[PDB]
Write a protein that binds this ligand. Structure first.
Ligand SMILES: Nc1nc2c(ncn2[C@@H]2O[C@H](COP(=O)(O)OP(=O)(O)OP(=O)(O)O)[C@@H](OP(=O)(O)OP(=O)(O)O)[C@H]2O)c(=O)[nH]1
Length: 440
């Protein structure tokens, strides 16, 4: 009635103390179990060709996982796991490494972090501690290499995309791989998987040995979305805001693909950091690119930025339509400039400390009628503030029409549409009307 198998640690959690093991033990038996189980299950389905995520999560009712204590360290016990994850009775290494990546970031980091009874005085409300914590997580994930030239390109894109956009992202990935650049994404399908599949080919063509494909996700996502099978360095941050800060501090360049309206929220976030005068001398290339069909999509998005943040916004990004070689060539040229930029201030090559991220951008935000109310949506205040309050505005009603939390108050309380300048509020509907005219 039950088939069992023991997995030894690989890639992480391979050198533990007995106290740490005992800590992991109770954590695996506290309320965190449901989260820990659903994440392990998602990892074990990376590569299973059932596109419907939640469909497959139910197919495995038998599955359960427990943590085994051994004098030396820990082992993972799997009860009735998916068959497609094994080869002649042995677990596929890639999955095995992701399997213990969950053990690390969910139980060791996530479960012991909220515990302030367990960890030292860690003021989660202090902006500095957050940044250093993000660093500690990445270091614990063995994702920060010493004295390595900048070659990491973060990529953001839509969850599900048409076959047309997918090919362009693959092509861009290939051109990035052909130039010995590595890739970091949201660890999912769609635009978060295509650039990796393409970069793998280029690396092979260039005989590039150690590809780094970093999937950076969070518990609520990975619990329902298995990671794409290209990810070879999995990382799960505790909060949404900590995941986004991780993206910014490890990246040496950022490429944004069409992601529907979410692209706007993602774009405003970056501008809120770059257009901060404290970051005037920072060097972080930003390219927004897409197939020939996404011409007007980015046009609409560009007019919005100009008409609200000013032409000054364009000195921080470049739009490239249907040219993969140019996108990759731009990023390759910027790497020495990043290296030179970090070297000019003494910053680390693998992690951007000096980049000032305002504390408002590191804290969670809830789309209630109160928080939204005091959104300063006029152009009189600093540009970097307007962009911050604009991000918190989009995602506010993003999940506010059909999301289980938005319509619980959108038809019981109605739309809020917080006070702002009559001109700015229209340039948005022009943006929303524009995305609708293209079936986004
Ligand atoms: N900013 C930075 N430097 C790093 C990093 N990892 C290694 N380094 C190296 O540390 C060295 C810099 O130390 P120093 O030689 O004393 O130069 P400093 O004037 O003191 O710079 P600083 O005061 O820190 O701002 C350089 O090596 P070399 O120049 O001697 O050789 P190579 O050219 O091959 O890289 C850097 O390449 C890193 O993550 N960030």
């Amino acid at each position: 009635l039950r088939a069992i198998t023991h997995i030894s640690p690989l890639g992480s959690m391979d050198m533990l103390s007995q106290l740490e093991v005992d800590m992991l033990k109770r954590t695996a038996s506290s309320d965190l179990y449901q989260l820990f189980r659903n994440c392990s299950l998602a990892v074990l389905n990376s590569g299973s060709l059932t596109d419907n995520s939640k469909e497959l999560l139910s197919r495995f009712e038998n599955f359960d996982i427990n943590v085994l204590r051994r004098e030396r360290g820990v082992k993972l016990e799997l009860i009735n796991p998916p068959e497609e994850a094994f080869v002649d009775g042995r677990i596929i290494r890639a999955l095995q490494a992701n399997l213990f990546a969950v053990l690390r970031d969910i139980l060791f980091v996530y479960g012991q972090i909220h515990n302030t009874v367990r960890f030292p005085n860690l003021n989660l409300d202090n902006s500095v501690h957050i940044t250093n914590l993000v660093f500690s997580i990445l270091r614990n994930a063995r994702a920060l290499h010493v004295g390595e030239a900048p070659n990491m390109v973060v990529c953001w894109g839509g969850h599900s995309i048409n076959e047309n956009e997918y090919l362009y992202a693959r092509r861009v990935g290939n051109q990035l791989g052909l130039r010995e650049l590595n890739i970091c994404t949201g660890c999912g399908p769609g635009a978060m998987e295509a650039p990796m599949k393409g970069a793998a080919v280029g690396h092979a063509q260039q005989r590039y040995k150690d590809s780094r494909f970093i999937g950076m996700t969070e518990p609520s996502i990975i619990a329902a979305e298995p990671p794409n099978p290209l990810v070879n360095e999995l990382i799960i941050m505790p909060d949404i805001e900590k995941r986004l800060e991780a993206f910014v501090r490890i990246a040496h360049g950022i490429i944004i693909f069409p992601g529907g309206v979410g692209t706007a929220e993602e774009l405003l976030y970056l501008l809120g950091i770059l257009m901060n005068p404290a970051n005037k001398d920072q060097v972080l290339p930003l390219i927004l690119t897409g197939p020939k069909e996404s011409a007007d999509y980015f046009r609409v998005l560009d007019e919005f930025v100009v008409h609200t943040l000013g032409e000054n916004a364009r000195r921080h990004y470049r739009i490239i339509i249907d040219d993969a070689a140019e996108v990759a060539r731009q990023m390759k040229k910027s790497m020495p400039l990043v290296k030179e930029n970090r070297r000019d201030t003494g910053d680390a090559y693998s992690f951007n400390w000096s980049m000032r991220i305002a504390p408002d951008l590191q804290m969670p935000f809830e789309p209630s009628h109160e928080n939204m109310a005091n959104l300063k949506l006029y152009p009189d205040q600093p540009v970097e503030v307007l962009a911050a309050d604009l991000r918190r505005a989009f995602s506010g009603i993003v999940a506010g029409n059909v999301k289980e939390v938005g319509i619980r108050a959108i038809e019981e309380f109605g739309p809020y549409k917080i006070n702002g300048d009559k001109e700015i509020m229209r340039r948005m509907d022009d943006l929303l009307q524009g995305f609708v005219a293209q079936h986004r």
